[PDB]
Amino acid sequence: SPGIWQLDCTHLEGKVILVAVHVASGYIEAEVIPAETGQETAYFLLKLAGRWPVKTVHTDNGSNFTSTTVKAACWWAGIKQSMNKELKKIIGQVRDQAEHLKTAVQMAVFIHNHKRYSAGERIVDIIATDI
Amino acid sequence: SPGIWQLDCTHLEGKVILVAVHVASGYIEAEVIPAETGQETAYFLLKLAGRWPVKTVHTDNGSNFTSTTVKAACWWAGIKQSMNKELKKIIGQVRDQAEHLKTAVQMAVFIHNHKRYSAGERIVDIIATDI
Lengths: 131, 131
Ligand SMILES: Cc1nc2ccccc2c(-c2ccc3c4c(ccnc24)CCO3)c1[C@H](OC(C)(C)C)C(=O)O
Ligand SMILES: Cc1nc2ccccc2c(-c2ccc3c4c(ccnc24)CCO3)c1[C@H](OC(C)(C)C)C(=O)O
What we know:
The PDB classes it as transferase/transferase inhibitor. Two copies of one chain form a homodimer. Chain A is an alpha+beta fold. Chain A has helices at about 40-50, 70-75, 85-95, 100-115, 120-130; strands spanning about 5-10, 15-20, 30-35, 55-60. Chain A has one domain: Nucleotidyltransferase, domain 5. The first copy, chain A, has a four-stranded mixed β-sheet, with helices on both faces. Chain A is globular.
């Protein structure tokens, strides 16, 4: 289904990377956050839901979604309940080219979503067709 | 053209809101940043370019784009050189429902992009057709 996303955090350099994957396309969005908290997860979900038609979200750590703040973001936005290793591979390849990890992360996201169709091309096609 | 974006900052509550508008669709992405700096603008452009096919960017304040950091983000991502009032209207309507301005901003972005086709529907259609 085109509405399914998966969200997980990854750790690197003592920081936290929140990674969202559109399951049908492989498209990724990511953000570096200071620590794993429900508030950061909730805020990310609000941003994601404003950009794409997010219907359901999965995760590999179910406890990620237990906080009152996450539940409120899900409620308001109407959300119901590998590539990560690929992303860390790309991050590692570009890491020395940037001062800050967050820059390297966005470089890796850019590379992933435009590498070849591309993931960025597939998501827009999938969503447009579903409309 | 489907590759044209406009970026501007707006001020509210002593904070800075960076607003990107996809010109052909009216779709918006926004972020609350602590202050107007080239580093924040450059980082935002890197994130935007990884998500959409950003070919050119416009602004109502040309000096926004003079810093070395912005130029480097543009160079790497291959970027060449009203609704904002609407967004402030929506922000004002939902502001008292959230503690933090940043939450109200993302609520307003969500409302704008899904209000009716919707801006979110138009951008994916425009980009998919262009492929
Ligand atoms: C601080 C807080 N604290 C909270 C404590 C308990 C429950 C929710 C929050 C919420 C909250 C979360 C998600 C929402 C909210 C909405 C209105 C009001 N609050 C929230 C509509 C959209 O989604 C929040 C919000 O802050 C974060 C989004 C960064 C967590 C807020 O600014 O009010
Ligand atoms: C701190 C800095 N300082 C700078 C000083 C001068 C010029 C660029 C920066 C850059 C820079 C900007 C854009 C890029 C960069 C890339 C590699 C290295 N640096 C950058 C590829 C993608 O786009 C940066 C980067 O930091 C921000 C992105 C937050 C500004 C960085 O982490 O290296």
